[PDB]
Structure formats: C-alpha cells, structure tokens
Design goal:
This is part of a larger assembly, with 1 copy of chain A (117 residues) and 6 copies of chain B (126 residues). Chain A is an alpha+beta fold and 117 residues long. Chain A has helices at residues 12-20, 40-44, 106-116; strands at 31-34, 52-60, 76-82, 96-97. Chain B has 126 residues and is mainly beta. Helix content of chain B is 0%, strand content 47%. A 6-stranded antiparallel sheet of chain B has the order 1-2-3-6-5-4, with no helix packed on it. The chains are: A alpha+beta (117), B mainly beta (126).
C-alpha cells in the first residue's frame, strides 16, 4: 500500500499522483498540481495536450473553528480539477465535422467517480 | 484600389450542414466564385499545434479581403473563403459582414476570421 | 524592413515538459531556428532582485521581434526565443502570437513577453 | 458638397401603420419627396439569407445620406428612404436622426440604418 | 472670430415660473439681450411629430452659440435663447453652460440644447 | 512662454480656518504673493444666480494659471488665488495641483477650479 | 538624445530595511551610482504642508528620468533616486519600472514617482 502524509486527508500532490495519473492513461502522467489557476491564457496553455491541473480554490471552514479552545475544529478545502483535450474530426463522406460539436463528458465523470469511490 | 494589389487567388464557397447519426454536426463547402483578391491583416493570431486559430469572441475579424463588386451576388452569413498558395499551406477564412468600398459600387470588401492553415485542410467541393 | 536593422542574433526554441516525482513541473527547451532578428520594446518592465519579470495579465506583449518569413515553419503556442549578447546577461522571451508584416509574406513578426535576464539562465538544448 | 457627388436617386417616405385582426402590425409607406442624394457607408452589414440586416442596437446608424435642405419639411421619427438602382436590388433605409451640414442651412444630412435588399421588397405607395 | 460669421439674429431671455392651481408648472420668458450670433451644430437631433427634441441625458449640448462678451451681464442657469428666421420655423435653445473664447474676454460662447421648432412656439415676452 | 501673454494680475493667498460657536466653519485668506499671470480656460462653467460654480468631483480643474517659478516658495493644498479686474467682477480660484512647465524650473503652472464671481466677494486680507 | 539635455545631477540608491522594537519599519539607503540625468514631468502633483506627495494607486509614474545605459547594472524593485539642486530643496524619487530607449542599448530610462521635497529630507548614506 501507499504511505500517506496525514491520516485523514490528502494534499493536492497526493491527488494528482494517486487518483488522476493511474486512471487516465491518455495523460502520459501530466497530472500537474499548481498553486492556482492564475497564469492561464498564455502561460499554461502551452503544456502538451491532454493534461489535467489540480489547484486550491480557497481554504474554508464548515462550522466552528476557534483555535485553542478545547472543542473540535472543522476545516474545508475547495480544489478544482481541470482537464484539456483535443477534438477528433473524422470527416465522413466528403464533409468535415464542425469545429464545435458535442463532446462526451459522461464517460470521464463516470471513470473519475469510480476511481474516487 | 490599383490592379497590381490583388496578388492572391481565392475561392468563395457556401456552407451546407446536417447531422450525423452520432449527433455530431457535418460541414461541406461548395465553390461558387473564383478570382483574384487582395488581403490585409488586422489582428494577431495564435496557432495550436496544427494551426487552428484560438480566440474567444468569434465575431471580431482578423483579415480584410477585397475583390470586384458584383451586383448579381448576395453574400450572406453562410459564406466562406478558401485560398491555396504556392508553398504555404492552404487556409480557410470565415466571412463576417460586408462593405462596399463606397457606394460607388465598384469593389466588395469582406471582413474575415482566419480558422485553419495546415496540410490536412479539406479542399472545397467543386 | 532594412537590412541594417537586424542587429540582434536569436535562437528560437520549442518547449517540452513533464512531471517530476514530487509533482512539480519540469521544462526542456530545444533550439530549432537561428538567425538575425530585430527587436523593439513596447512596454516597461519591473525586475525582481534577480531580474525575473513581475507582471500579471500574461497575454500582454512587451517586445516585438521581426525576422525573415519562413513558409516551411509552423509557429505555435509552445514557442520561445533565446538571445545571448556581447556583455548584457542572456534573456528569454516567451512568444505570445504571430503576424505577417503583410500578406506579401516576406517577414514574420512575433509578439513576446520578457521573462528572465541573469547569469544563471539556462542555455537552449542544442 | 459638389454637384457631381449626388449619384443616387432616392424616394423619401412616411410611415402609416395599424393592427390586423390577428393582432399583427401592418405597415404602409408613402412617397413624399423626390430628388438625388449622396450616400456614404459608415459601418459593416451582415446579411441573412435574403438580405435583411441582422444587428442589435437598432439606434446605430450605418449610412449617411445627404440632399438639399428644405425649409418647408419637418422630417421626424416616422421617416424612411427608398432607392432603386440599375442592377442591384432595391433597398430600404430607416431614418434615425437629422442634421444640417451647418446652420448655413443648405443641405440636409440623415443618419440611417439599412434594413432590406432583395427582389421582393415592396415599392413605395405612390 | 470674423465679422461675417454672425449670420443669425437671436434674443436672449430669462425664465420666470410658478404653479397653476391644477398643480402643473407654468413658464414665462422675458427678452433681455438682442444681437447677432454665430451657431454651430454638434450632435444629431431626432424630431417628434411636432419637432420637439427627444434626448435622454438632458445635460448634453448640441449647438454652440457665440456672441460678444459683455462684462455687465451675468449669465446663469435660468437662461434661454430665441431665434426667428426668414422661412424656417422659430426655435428655442436652452443654455447649459458658458465659456469665454479665452481669458482675453472678447466673446462669450454658450453650450445649448435645442428644444422646439414649430409654428406654435411661444414668442418671447417683450 | 512669451512676456506679452501675462495679461492678468493676481494675488496668491493662504487659508486659515476655525470653528464658530454655532459649529459652522469660518475661512480667512491672507495675501502672500502678487504678480502678473496668464490664464487659460479648460472646461465650461455653470453659474448659479450669484455666480458660484456648480460642480461635483471638485478635484478636476477648470483654468490653467502660469507665473514665474520661485524656488523659495512651497505651494501646498491650502493655496488660493484672487483676481480683481477692470470691469469684470472679482473671482476666486482654488488650487488643485502644481506643475513646472519643465524641469528647467523657470515657470510654475497651477491647475485651478473657479469658485465665485460677483460683487460681494471678500477681498484678500492684507 | 543630445548631450546638453542632462542638466540634472542625481544619486541612485538601494534600499535596506528592518523592524524597530516598537514594530515600526525603518528604511536606510545607500548611494551606488553617480551621473547626470535628464528629467521630464508627466503628471501634476499636490503637496502637503511639508511637500510630501499625495497620490492614489501609488505606482503611476510622474517623472521620466533618463541616463546612460549600463550593462553591468541590474536595476530592481528596491531602487531610488536622489537630487540636490542649487536652491530648491532636495527631492526623492521612487523607481517604478525601467526601459531601454531602444534595444540599441545606449540609454536607460526610469519611470518614477516623486515623494518628498523639503529641507529635512535625509541625505543618502555614502
């Protein structure tokens, strides 16, 4: 088995290493944790496709979080997994497929959820 | 406009589309006009690994195309433009709007968005 | 363009990247084109203690680079630029977008953002 | 405004409208002023399959029409303009606003939006 | 400014207003200055059936009126302007703001908004 | 800045303020500099019945005042300007900001907002 | 740029800072470069009672300073600039960003914001 940094939660690198990389073979790795989605439209897009980023959204609390006082402490972590894929265009019958067309996400969702479960 | 300017040779096409069984949309484009034309850039471009232009806000043009005005033609939304050159790969333009050089009605100027430029581009249906 | 303008000698590179075991991102950059080029500034720069540019809005270009148009090249997102000068520290430019000087198709102009300038900068993989 | 400019021949009209039994609104256009005019484009146009302009912000003018100032006229909201040509299909303009070339009060300029251009356009009620 | 420019003859009036018994507001206007003036348009106008202007942002001026600077006059908010012409219907301007042509203090320029132009316009109280 | 320009004669004052017993604020202004100056308008004005300006966003200037630079002076927020003319009523300016014509350090230019112009204006404390 | 322009004499400094025991932030600054410079204003300023500038957004440059380009120097964020003049009080500038006049690499231009000008200004640590 693996060895976890903590007993009951996973840091983003752990996600990118153990939930994303082993499931999606399309990504030859390239499950890259990042500080946040900030340098986007011309900094990160150059990465080879397909690839997936993992980045914190905001740290938050789900209830009482008074430090020190002898009561439980609850914490929340919002993080986002963003993929990137090309487009297949099979051009059947002397006609191309349009640059915009339905793309299958249900399969990706099912695979991801099954792995998380 | 002067005669010498129109260096480029272009083919104007019309779009017909339908639906595959899988639900994805199919495009086929038919050549309708032939002639020389003059082309000017208006905006920068960013190419993906295979030259398909990447930009939001599809409605803004990038290249200006001018050719002889034709009273017997009725350009519309479904237009396109095609160009095959000596060495550089072919290219597809999408036509946005239209404008006479003036109401003198001598030359028709199109505003276009560049889409693709690579060896695999489909050539217009004759 | 005039011949005398192209003072600067540059090396154009392509990017290759992967993931370390620790999850961090590693970048490898390969020389692919070499030639003289002319450079112009467009915007001011703010240097950290080691000269790495500080600015958000990464789509903002800073320097314009012009060089001979090459029909057999297909610039794309993953481009870079490298320049080693007589005394000044090396510098890396990141290519944002491309544009022909005109559809005359003689000279290729790049829009770039400066990244680094210091002695520790790596040199392009030959 | 030199004499030779006023190439185009136009028919100015006033609108009269009412309600059908079905609730749909009916428009009738009447010819009232005759003369020559000069026309200048100001903005691009996008034509549907049958030439009816497609644009939001209906207050935006497209073509500037100039003709002789007439002190005995009271151009107002309900104005239109009609024009028939040698080969090109007829066209309807909608008048947005009016302006004297100057308070010299010699020539009346109209700001207009193009609407239709096709063979089925109704001709002004004489 | 040259002498010949001041084609137009205008009457400058002050406003006096009160309340009817019905609760509506009544306006009265008094002639106070006579002289020639020069006028220049700035913006297009949209006329209702009886030529009363129609604009939001009522503070936006349309016409600039220029005439001799008078140190003994104190133009203020309640100003107006009246003009009766050879054939054209009378017209009322409302004064938005004032400006010296320069601190040379020779000519006073007014920014104005057009209001009405028709045969029923009230003429200034003598 | 040619000599002849400085038509206007002005007095520069400093503001001293305190509180009345009723809580209302009191102003006192003391002449500190006198000399010829040149004045230029920058924006229109809208006068109340007694000529007090009507503006929000008071930080924007209206008139540009230029006079000889003085290294032994330190203009600051609390400045004012006063001007009494041959026939026109006295006027108060409020100083927004300062600027050298250039770092040549010869002429000091102020940006000011006009406040009042009427016969009842207080004259600067001698 | 011509030789004669560089009227002004300036001292370029670097900043080192630490924390007092009370929590206050202490700044000390040392001169590092000597030379002449040319200075131009870009924006008006308004002084407090002792000449410390008041400004929002705190990094919109006001004065442009130009001097000889030095390839052996690496300007960074922590820069400052000093100027002691014949009669006027000494002044501090804060360096916002840097730019070569051109990639000809002959002259270095700094975008700067003025801060202080009064007799009590600390002079650079030699």
């Amino acid at each position: 088995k693996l060895k976890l940094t903590y007993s009951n939660r996973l840091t983003l690198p752990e996600i990118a290493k153990h939930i994303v990389s082993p499931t999606f073979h399309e990504l030859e790795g390239r499950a890259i944790p990042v500080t946040g989605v900030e340098d986007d439209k011309e900094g990160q897009s150059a990465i080879t496709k397909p690839f997936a980023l993992v980045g914190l959204r905001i740290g938050d609390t789900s209830g009482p979080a008074e430090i020190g006082e002898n009561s439980r402490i609850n914490l929340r972590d919002d993080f986002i997994i963003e993929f990137n894929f090309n487009k297949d265009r099979y051009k059947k019958g002397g006609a191309e497929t349009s640059l915009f067309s339905y793309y299958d996400y249900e399969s990706i969702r099912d695979r991801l959820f099954n792995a998380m479960v | 406009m002067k005669i010498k300017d129109r260096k480029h040779r272009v083919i104007v096409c019309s779009q017909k589309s339908d639906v595959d069984d899988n639900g994805q949309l199919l495009i086929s484009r038919t050549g309708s006009i032939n002639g020389w034309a003059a082309i000017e850039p208006v905006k920068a471009i960013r190419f993906s690994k295979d030259g398909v232009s990447m930009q939001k806000d599809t409605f803004q043009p990038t290249h200006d195309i001018t050719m002889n005005y034709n009273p017997d033609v009725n350009i519309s939304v479904s237009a396109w433009v095609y160009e095959h050159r000596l060495k550089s790969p072919p290219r597809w333009f999408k036509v946005i709007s239209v404008i006479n050089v003036d109401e003198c009605s001598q030359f028709m100027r199109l505003r276009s968005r560049l889409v693709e430029s690579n060896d695999e581009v489909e050539k217009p249906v004759s």
